[PDB]
Amino acid sequence: DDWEIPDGQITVGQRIGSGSFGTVYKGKWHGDVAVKMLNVTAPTPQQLQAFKNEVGVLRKTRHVNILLFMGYSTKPQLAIVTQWCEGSSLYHHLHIIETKFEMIKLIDIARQTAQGMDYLHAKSIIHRDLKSNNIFLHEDLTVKIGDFGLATVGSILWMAPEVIRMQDKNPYSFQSDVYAFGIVLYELMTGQLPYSNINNRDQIIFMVGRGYLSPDLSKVRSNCPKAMKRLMAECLKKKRDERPLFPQILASIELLARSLPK
């Protein structure tokens, strides 16, 4: 029953990058797997908590749109094993290799992302770090939401105005994830990161915080549906209580998707 994998069964290969509280590798364990490892000599009580926190969250998830947790390892280093997804993240497709997706496919990505987030919020799981980079495209058609190191039951462009000015203790909520989803909606419909004409990071942080800066919604492409643009503005509201929850958001995307191919 237990998910602890006996040591050395995981064959660590190519270093593919870094996630939250670890370095990610392409491993081999009963096929191709993604393994997030600590590569640190001795784990801190800080790093030990962050490990058991993520594993505890991941073992509560069983969904087609959530990155499938396969197991964990403690004996060599603190490692977490998930499924391998050929084809890079949504951030990579849109901003690195500049892949040109069709509107039908762009909305399908947004629908699956909302579908996975609805599954998390139903199980009272707040991602707290939802971004294009944590949204993974498996086989170029299936969306997988990954990296749950900051989940509770770094990147500023997806952070809500409430989150960016730390008051009070917990600015993270279901609606804070909605804003982060609002930004990935923007990215899909524009093909660009928000505030791209501004180079100063500290000026963006301050300007979103005080409520002077909001994403340029008129940047969306001409073939983007009016129902998509309207939903985008609802998710990107400065006040969190004026934002819809994912049960409502999912139903909105599913509605505009059916009256789209015609």
Query: Does the bond joining 140 to the residue before it have cis omega, within 30 degrees of 0?
Result: no
Minimum distance from residue 75 beta carbon to ligand SM7 (Å): 17
Task: Decide if 117 contacts 177 (C-beta within 8 A).
Answer: yes
Residue in 38, 66, 78, 80 binding ligand SM7, rule: CB under 6 A: 80
Q: What is the C-alpha radius of gyration for the chain, rounded to an integer number of angstroms?
A: 19
Binding status of residue 70 toward ligand SM7 by CB under 6 A: no
- Considering the complex, state which of residue 24 and residue 231 has its C-beta at the smaller distance from ligand SM7: 24
Task: Decide if 21 contacts 51 (C-beta within 8 A).
Answer: yes
- Considering the complex, state which of residue 73 and residue 252 has its C-beta at the smaller distance from ligand SM7: 73
User: Does the active-site annotation cover 1?
Assistant: no
Could you tell me the two tokens for 134? 């944590």
- The answer to whether 17 is annotated as binding is yes
| Beta carbons within 8 Å of 112's beta carbon, 6+ residues apart | 65, 142, 143
Q: Measuring CA to CA, which residue among 161, 197, 159 is closest to residue 180?
A: 159
Q: Which of 108, 118, 129, 147 is catalytic?
A: 129
Question: How many C-beta atoms lie closer than 10 Å to residue 30's C-beta?
Answer: 11
Q: Measuring CA to CA, which residue among 55, 61, 51 is closest to residue 125?
A: 61
Q: Measuring CA to CA, which residue among 146, 148, 132, 142 is closest to residue 97?
A: 132
Segment near ligand SM7 (CB under 6 A), from 17-25, 162-170, 179-187, 213-221?
A: 17-25
Task: Give the span between the Cα atoms of 182 and 174, in whole angstroms.
Answer: 13
Segment near ligand SM7 (CB under 6 A), from 80-88, 121-129, 155-163, 215-223?
A: 80-88
- The answer to whether 24 is annotated as binding is yes
- Considering the complex, state which of residue 24 and residue 228 has its C-beta at the smaller distance from ligand SM7: 24
Instruction: List the interface residues with ligand SM7, window 209-248 (CB under 6 A).
Output: none
Minimum distance from residue 159 beta carbon to ligand SM7 (Å): 19
* CA of residue 39 relative to chain centroid, distance: 24
Task: Give the span between the Cα atoms of 132 and 127, in whole angstroms.
Answer: 13
Task: Give the span between the Cα atoms of 181 and 186, in whole angstroms.
Answer: 9
Instruction: List the interface residues with ligand SM7, window 158-177 (CB under 6 A).
Output: none
Binding mask 94-133 for ligand SM7 (x = CB under 6 A): ---------------------------------------x
Residue in 34, 38, 66, 235 binding ligand SM7, rule: CB under 6 A: 34
What is residue 9's DSSP assignment? S
Backbone angles phi, psi at 83, to 5 degrees: -70, 155
Segment near ligand SM7 (CB under 6 A), from 78-86, 109-117, 161-169, 194-202?
A: 78-86
- The answer to whether 116 is annotated as binding is no
Residue nearest to ligand SM7 (CB): 17
- Would you name the residues annotated as active-site residues? 129
Annotated binding site: 16-24, 36
Residue numbers of the site for ligand SM7 (CB under 6 A)? 16-17, 19, 24, 34, 36, 67, 80, 82, 84-85, 88-89, 92, 133, 136, 146-147
